[PDB]
Short mmCIF file of C-alpha atoms and ligand atoms in Angstrom, two decimals:
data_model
loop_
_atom_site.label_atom_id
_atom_site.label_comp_id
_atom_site.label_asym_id
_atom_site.label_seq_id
_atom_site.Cartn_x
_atom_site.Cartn_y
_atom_site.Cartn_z
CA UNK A 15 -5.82 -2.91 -18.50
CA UNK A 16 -8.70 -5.21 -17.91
CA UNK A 17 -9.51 -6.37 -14.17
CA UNK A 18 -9.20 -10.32 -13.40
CA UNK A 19 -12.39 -12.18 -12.07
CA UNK A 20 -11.70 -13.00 -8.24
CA UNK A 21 -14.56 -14.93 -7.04
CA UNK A 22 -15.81 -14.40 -3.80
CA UNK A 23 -16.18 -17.71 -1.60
CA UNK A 24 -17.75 -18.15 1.59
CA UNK A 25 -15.22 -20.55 3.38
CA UNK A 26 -17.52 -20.86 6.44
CA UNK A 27 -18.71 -24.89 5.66
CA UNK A 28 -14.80 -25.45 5.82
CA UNK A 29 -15.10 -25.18 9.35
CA UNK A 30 -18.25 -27.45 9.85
CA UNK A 31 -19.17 -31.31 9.13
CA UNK A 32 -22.27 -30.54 6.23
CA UNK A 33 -19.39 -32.68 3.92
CA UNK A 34 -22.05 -31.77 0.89
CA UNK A 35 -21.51 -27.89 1.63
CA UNK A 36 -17.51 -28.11 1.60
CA UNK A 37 -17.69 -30.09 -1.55
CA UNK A 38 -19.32 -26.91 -2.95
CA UNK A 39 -16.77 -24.59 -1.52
CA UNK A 40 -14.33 -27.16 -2.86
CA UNK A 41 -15.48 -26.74 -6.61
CA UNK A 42 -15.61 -22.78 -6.44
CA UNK A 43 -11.88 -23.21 -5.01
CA UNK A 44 -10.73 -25.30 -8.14
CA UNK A 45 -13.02 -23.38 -10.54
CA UNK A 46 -10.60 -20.15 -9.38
CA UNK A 47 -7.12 -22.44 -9.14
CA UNK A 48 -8.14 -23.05 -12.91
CA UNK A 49 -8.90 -19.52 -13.76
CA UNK A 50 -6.86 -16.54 -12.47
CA UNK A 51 -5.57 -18.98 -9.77
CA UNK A 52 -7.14 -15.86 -7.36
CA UNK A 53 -9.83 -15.95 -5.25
CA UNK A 54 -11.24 -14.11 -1.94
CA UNK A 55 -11.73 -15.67 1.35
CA UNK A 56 -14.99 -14.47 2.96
CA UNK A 57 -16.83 -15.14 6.31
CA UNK A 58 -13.36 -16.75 7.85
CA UNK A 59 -13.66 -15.45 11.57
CA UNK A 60 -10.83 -13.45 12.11
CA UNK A 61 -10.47 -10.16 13.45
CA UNK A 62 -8.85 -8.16 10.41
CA UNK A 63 -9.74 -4.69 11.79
CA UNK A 64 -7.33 -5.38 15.04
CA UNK A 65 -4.93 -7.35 12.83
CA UNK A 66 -4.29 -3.70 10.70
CA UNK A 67 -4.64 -1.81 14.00
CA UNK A 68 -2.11 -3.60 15.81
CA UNK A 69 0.03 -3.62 12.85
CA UNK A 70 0.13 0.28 12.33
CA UNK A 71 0.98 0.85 16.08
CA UNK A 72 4.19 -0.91 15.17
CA UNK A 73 5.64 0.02 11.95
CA UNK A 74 4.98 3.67 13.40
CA UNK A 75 6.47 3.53 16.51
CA UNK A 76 9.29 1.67 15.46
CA UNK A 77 12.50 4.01 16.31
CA UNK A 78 16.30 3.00 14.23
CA UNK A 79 17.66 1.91 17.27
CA UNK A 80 15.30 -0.70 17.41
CA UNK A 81 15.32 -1.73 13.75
CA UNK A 82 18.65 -2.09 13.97
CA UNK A 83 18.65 -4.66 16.90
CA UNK A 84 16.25 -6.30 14.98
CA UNK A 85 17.47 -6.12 11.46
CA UNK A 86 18.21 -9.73 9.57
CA UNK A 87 21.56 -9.99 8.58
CA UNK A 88 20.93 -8.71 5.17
CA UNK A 89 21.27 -5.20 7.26
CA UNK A 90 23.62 -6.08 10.28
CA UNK A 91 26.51 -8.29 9.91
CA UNK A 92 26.51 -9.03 13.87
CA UNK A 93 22.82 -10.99 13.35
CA UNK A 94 24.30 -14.28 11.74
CA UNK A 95 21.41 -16.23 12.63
CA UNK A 96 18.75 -14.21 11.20
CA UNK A 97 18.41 -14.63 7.61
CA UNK A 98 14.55 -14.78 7.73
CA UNK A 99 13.06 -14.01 11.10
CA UNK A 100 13.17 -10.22 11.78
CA UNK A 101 13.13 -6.53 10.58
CA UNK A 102 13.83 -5.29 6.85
CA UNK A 103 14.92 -1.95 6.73
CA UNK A 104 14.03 0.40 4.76
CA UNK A 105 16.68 2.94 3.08
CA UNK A 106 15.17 6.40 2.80
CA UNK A 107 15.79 7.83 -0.56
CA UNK A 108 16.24 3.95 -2.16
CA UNK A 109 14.11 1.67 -0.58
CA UNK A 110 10.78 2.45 1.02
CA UNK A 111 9.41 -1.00 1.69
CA UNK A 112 10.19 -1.97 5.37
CA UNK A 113 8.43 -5.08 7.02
CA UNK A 114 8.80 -7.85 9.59
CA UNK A 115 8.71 -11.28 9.74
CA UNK A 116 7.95 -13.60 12.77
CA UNK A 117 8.11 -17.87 12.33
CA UNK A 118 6.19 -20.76 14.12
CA UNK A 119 6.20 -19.75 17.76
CA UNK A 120 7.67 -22.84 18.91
CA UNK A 121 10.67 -22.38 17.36
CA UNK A 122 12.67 -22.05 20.76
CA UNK A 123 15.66 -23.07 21.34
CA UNK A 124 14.59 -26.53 23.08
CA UNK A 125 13.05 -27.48 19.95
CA UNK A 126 14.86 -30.17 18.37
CA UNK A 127 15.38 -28.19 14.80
CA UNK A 128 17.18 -25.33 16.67
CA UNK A 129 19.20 -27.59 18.40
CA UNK A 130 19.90 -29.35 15.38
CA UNK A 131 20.81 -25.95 13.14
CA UNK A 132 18.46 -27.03 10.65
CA UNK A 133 18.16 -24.60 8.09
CA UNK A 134 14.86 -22.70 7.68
CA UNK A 135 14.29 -22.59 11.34
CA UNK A 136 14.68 -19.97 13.40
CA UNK A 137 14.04 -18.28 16.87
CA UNK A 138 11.92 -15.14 16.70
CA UNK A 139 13.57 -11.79 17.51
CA UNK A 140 11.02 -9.90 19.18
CA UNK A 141 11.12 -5.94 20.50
CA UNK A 142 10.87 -4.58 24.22
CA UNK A 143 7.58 -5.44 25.08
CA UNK A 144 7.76 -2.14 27.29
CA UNK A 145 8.20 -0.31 24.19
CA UNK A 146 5.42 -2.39 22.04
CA UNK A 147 3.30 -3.75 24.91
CA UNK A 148 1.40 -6.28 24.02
CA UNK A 149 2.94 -6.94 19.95
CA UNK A 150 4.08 -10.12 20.86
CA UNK A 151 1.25 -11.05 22.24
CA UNK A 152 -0.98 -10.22 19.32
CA UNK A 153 1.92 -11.37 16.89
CA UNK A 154 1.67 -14.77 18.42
CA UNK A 155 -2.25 -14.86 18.45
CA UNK A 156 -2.48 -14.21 14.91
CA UNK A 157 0.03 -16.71 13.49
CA UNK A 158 -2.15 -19.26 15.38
CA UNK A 159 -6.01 -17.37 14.39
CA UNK A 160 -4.17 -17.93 10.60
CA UNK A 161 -3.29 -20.85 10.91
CA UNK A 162 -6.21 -22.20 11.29
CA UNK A 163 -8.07 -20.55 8.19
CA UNK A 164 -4.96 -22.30 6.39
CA UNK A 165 -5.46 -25.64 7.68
CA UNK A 166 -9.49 -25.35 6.69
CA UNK A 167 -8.36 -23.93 2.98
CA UNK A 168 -6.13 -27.14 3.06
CA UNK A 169 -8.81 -29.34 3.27
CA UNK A 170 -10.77 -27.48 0.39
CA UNK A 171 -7.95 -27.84 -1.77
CA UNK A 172 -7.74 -31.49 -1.06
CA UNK A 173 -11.48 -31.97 -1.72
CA UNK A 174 -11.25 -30.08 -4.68
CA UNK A 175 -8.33 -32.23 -6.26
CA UNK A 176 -10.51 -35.57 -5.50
CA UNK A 177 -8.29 -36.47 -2.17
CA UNK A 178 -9.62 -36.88 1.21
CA UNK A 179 -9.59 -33.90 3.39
CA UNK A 180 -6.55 -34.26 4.94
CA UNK A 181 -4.41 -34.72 2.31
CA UNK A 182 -2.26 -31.17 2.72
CA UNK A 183 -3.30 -30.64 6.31
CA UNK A 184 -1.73 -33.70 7.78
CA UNK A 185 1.79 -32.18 6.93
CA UNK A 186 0.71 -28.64 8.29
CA UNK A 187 1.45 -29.11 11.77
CA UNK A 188 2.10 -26.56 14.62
CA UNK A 189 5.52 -28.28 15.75
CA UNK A 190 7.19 -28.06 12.84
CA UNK A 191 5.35 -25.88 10.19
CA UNK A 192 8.08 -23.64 8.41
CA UNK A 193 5.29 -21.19 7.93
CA UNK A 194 5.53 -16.98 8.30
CA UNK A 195 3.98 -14.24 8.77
CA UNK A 196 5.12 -10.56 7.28
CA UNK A 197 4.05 -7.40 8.18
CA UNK A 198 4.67 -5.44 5.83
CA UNK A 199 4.69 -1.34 5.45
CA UNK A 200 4.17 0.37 1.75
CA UNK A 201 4.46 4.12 2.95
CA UNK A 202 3.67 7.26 1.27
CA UNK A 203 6.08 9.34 0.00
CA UNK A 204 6.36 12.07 -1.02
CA UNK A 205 9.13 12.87 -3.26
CA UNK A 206 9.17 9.18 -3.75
CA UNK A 207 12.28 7.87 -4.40
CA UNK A 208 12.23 6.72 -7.89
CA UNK A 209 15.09 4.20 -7.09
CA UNK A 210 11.81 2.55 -5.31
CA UNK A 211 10.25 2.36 -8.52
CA UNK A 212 10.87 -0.65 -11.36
CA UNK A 213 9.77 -0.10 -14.61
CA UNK A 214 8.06 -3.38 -16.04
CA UNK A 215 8.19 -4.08 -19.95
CA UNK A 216 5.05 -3.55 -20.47
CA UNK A 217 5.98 0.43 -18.90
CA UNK A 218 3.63 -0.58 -15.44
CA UNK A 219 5.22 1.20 -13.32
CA UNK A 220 6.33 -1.69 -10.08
CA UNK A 221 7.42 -1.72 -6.33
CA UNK A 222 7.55 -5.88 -6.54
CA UNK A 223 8.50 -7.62 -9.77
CA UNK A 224 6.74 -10.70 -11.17
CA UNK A 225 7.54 -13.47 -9.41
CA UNK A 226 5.54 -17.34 -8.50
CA UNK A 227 5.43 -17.69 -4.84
CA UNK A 228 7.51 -19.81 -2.58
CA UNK A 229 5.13 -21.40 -0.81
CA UNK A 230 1.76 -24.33 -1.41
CA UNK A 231 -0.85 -21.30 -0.45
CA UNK A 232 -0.64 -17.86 0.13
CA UNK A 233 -3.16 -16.24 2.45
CA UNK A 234 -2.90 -12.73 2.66
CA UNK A 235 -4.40 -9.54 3.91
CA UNK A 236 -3.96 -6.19 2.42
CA UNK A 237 -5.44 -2.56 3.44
CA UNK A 238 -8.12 -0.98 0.57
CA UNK A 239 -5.32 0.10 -1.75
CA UNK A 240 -5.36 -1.84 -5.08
CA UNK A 241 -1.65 -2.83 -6.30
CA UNK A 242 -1.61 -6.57 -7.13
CA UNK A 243 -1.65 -7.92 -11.22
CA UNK A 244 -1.72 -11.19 -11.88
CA UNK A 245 -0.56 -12.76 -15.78
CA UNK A 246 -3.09 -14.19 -17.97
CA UNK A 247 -1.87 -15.06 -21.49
CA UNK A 248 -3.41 -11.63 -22.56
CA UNK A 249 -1.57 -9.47 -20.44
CA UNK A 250 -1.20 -8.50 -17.08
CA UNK A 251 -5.05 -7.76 -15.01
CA UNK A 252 -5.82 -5.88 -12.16
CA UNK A 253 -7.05 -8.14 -8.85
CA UNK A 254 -9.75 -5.57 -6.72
CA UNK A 255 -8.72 -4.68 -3.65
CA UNK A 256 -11.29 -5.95 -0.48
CA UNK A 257 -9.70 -5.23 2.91
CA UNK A 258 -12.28 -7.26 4.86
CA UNK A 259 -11.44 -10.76 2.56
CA UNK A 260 -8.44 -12.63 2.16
CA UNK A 261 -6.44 -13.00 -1.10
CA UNK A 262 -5.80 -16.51 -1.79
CA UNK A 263 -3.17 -17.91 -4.36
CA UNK A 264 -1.42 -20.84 -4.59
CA UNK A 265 2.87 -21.34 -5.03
CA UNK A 266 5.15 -23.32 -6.57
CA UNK A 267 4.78 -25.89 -4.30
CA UNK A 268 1.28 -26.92 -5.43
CA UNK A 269 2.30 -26.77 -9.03
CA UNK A 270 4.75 -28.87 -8.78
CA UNK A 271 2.53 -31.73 -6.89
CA UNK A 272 0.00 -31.14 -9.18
CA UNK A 273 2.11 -31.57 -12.58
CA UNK A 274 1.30 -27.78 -12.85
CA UNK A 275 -2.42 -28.68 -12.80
CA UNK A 276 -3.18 -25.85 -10.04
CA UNK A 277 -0.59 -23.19 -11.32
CA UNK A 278 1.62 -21.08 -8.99
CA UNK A 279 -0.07 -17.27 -10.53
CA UNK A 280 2.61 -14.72 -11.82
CA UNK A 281 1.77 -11.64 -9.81
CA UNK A 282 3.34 -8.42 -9.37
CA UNK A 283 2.78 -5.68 -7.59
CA UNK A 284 1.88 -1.85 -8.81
CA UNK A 285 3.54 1.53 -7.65
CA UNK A 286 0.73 3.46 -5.79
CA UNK A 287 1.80 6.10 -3.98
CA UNK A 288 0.06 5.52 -1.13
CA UNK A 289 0.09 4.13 3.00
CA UNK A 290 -0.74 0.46 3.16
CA UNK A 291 -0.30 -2.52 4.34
CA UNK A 292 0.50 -6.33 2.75
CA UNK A 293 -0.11 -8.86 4.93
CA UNK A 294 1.02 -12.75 3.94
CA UNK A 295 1.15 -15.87 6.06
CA UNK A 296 3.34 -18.28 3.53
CA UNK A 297 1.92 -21.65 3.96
CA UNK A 298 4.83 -23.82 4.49
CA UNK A 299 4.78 -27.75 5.66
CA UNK A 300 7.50 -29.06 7.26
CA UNK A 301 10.88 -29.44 6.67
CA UNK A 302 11.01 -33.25 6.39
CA UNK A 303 7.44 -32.83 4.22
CA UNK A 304 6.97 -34.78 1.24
CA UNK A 305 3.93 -35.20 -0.96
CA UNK A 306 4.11 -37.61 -3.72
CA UNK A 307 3.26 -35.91 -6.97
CA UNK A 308 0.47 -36.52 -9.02
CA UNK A 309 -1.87 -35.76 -12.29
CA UNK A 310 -5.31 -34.43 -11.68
CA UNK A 311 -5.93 -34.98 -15.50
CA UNK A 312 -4.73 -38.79 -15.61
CA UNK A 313 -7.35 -41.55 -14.99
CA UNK A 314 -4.53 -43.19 -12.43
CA UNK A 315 -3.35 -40.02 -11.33
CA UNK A 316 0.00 -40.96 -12.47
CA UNK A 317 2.99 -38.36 -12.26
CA UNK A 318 6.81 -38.89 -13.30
CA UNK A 319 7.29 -35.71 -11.17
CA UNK A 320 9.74 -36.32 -8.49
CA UNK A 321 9.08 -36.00 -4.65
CA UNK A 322 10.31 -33.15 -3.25
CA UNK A 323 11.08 -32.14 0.48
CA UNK A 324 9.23 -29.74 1.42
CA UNK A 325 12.83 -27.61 3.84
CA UNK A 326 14.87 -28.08 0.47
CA UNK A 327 11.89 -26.36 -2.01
CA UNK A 328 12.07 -23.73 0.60
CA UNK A 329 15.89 -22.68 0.68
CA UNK A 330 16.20 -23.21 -2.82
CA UNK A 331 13.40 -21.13 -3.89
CA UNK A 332 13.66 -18.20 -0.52
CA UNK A 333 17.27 -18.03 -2.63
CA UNK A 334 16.25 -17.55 -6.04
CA UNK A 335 13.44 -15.47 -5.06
CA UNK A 336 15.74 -13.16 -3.40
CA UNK A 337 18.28 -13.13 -6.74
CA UNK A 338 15.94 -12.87 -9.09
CA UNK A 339 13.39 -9.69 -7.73
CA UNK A 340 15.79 -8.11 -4.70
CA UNK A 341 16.66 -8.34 -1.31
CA UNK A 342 13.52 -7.19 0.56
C1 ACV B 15 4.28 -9.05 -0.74
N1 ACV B 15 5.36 -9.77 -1.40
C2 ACV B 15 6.22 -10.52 -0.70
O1 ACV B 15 6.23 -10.57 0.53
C3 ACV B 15 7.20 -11.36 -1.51
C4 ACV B 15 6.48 -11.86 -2.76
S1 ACV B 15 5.14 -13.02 -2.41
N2 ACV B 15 7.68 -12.47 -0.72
C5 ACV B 15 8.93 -12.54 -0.25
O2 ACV B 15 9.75 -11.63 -0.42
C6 ACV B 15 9.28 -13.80 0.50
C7 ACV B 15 9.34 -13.57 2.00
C8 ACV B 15 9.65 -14.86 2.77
C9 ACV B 15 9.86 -14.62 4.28
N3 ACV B 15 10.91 -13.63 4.60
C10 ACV B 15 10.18 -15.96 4.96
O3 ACV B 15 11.12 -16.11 5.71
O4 ACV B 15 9.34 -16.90 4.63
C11 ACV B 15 4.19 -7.65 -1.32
O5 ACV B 15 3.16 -7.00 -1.29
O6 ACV B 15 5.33 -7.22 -1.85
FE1 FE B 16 3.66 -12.99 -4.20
#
């Protein structure tokens, strides 16, 4: 199995005015949207080392009681309303991924999309912050430290595509994004439960199936534990792991406005026996979000792709994702 080629970028101009410096971070972005479709994030500013920390206190404090008053409704049929925001069990001798997923702080319930029951949005379930003190807290921080790596990799994928730099960004807003965060926990275990285990064609041994994402970007952070392979028309390749980076992909999303110019990568992800962590923030726009498609390889740019809103993409494809590689 050969390993893929993951360029390292330096996002740092994205956060500055030298407009000849993000051009250049804007060709290394579409050089790797064009290749593997992988690529690292370096020099971005945020504290990963606190991010894992923080993140291990929980999943290993964590007692049933509380995962159960937590638990989407995939696990408790009393939690109606929780279909994405909250905890994922785990079911010892089946399942041993667990994780937990948090939404755009705002969502409360004066905001207009709660009150409306709009689908996709969601109030967070949180636990006793006398239990966890200070998880929220962090949780909150974070989604907002994120998002605003996301909204500078927004404007490098604009510049690379030949639009101005706001051409994503503008519908990535903090009122409305449909954006999330999961913390997820890949234990060790040990006998591991080989119901856990998928068994590719290939004979790779899986915990995650291949799959496109549901999302326009992906920005995730994983522990030094290598487990992701991404499809190249010669087989499957190992991505390196690089727990100080992010791992940057794009989703359906951005194929689809780009007449599958920047592909959505088919990834999976590797059995490894082994503790670690997996990290995303989705990048979602909003639910009313529309982009009108269009060709990167046409003189006039011209797509017959159809415009698609950005909250129905999302329970479509959170749906399909779900029947096609398990619930989660
Ligand atoms: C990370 N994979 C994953 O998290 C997989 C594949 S990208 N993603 C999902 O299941 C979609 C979670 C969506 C989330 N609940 C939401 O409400 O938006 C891994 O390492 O398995
Ligand atoms: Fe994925």
């Amino acid at each position: 199995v050969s390993k893929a080629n993951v360029p390292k970028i330096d996002v740092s101009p994205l956060f500055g005015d030298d407009q000849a410096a993000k051009m250049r971070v804007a060709q290394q972005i579409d050089a790797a949207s064009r290749d593997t479709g992988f690529f690292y994030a370096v020099n971005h500013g945020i504290n990963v080392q606190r991010l894992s920390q923080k993140t291990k206190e929980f999943h290993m404090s964590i007692t049933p009681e509380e995962k159960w008053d937590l638990a989407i409704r995939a696990y408790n049929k009393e939690h109606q309303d929780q279909v994405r925001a909250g905890y994922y069990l785990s079911i010892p001798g089946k399942k041993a991924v667990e994780s937990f997923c948090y939404l755009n702080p705002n969502f409360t319930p004066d905001h207009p999309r709660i009150q409306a029951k709009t689908p996709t949005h969601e109030v967070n379930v949180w636990p006793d912050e006398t239990k966890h003190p200070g998880f929220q807290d962090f949780a909150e921080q974070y989604y907002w430290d994120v998002f605003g790596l996301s909204s500078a990799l927004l404007k490098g994928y604009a510049l690379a595509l030949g639009k101005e730099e706001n051409f994503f960004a503008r519908h990535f807003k903090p009122d409305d994004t449909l954006a999330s965060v999961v913390l997820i926990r890949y234990p060790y275990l040990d006998p591991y439960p080989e119901a856990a285990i998928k068994t590719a064609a290939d004979g790779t041994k899986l915990s995650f199936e291949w799959h496109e994402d549901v999302s326009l970007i992906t920005v995730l952070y994983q522990s030094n534990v290598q487990n992701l392979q991404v499809e190249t028309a010669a087989g499957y390749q190992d991505i390196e792991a690089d727990d100080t980076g992010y791992l940057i992909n794009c989703g359906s999303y951005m194929a689809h406005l780009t007449n599958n110019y920047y592909k959505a990568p088919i990834h999976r992800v590797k059995w490894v026996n082994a503790e670690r962590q997996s990290l995303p923030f989705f990048v979602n726009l909003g639910y009313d979000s529309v982009i009108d498609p269009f060709d990167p390889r046409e003189p006039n740019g011209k797509s017959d792709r159809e415009p698609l809103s950005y909250g129905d993409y999302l329970q479509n494809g959170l749906v399909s994702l779900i029947n096609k590689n398990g619930q989660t």
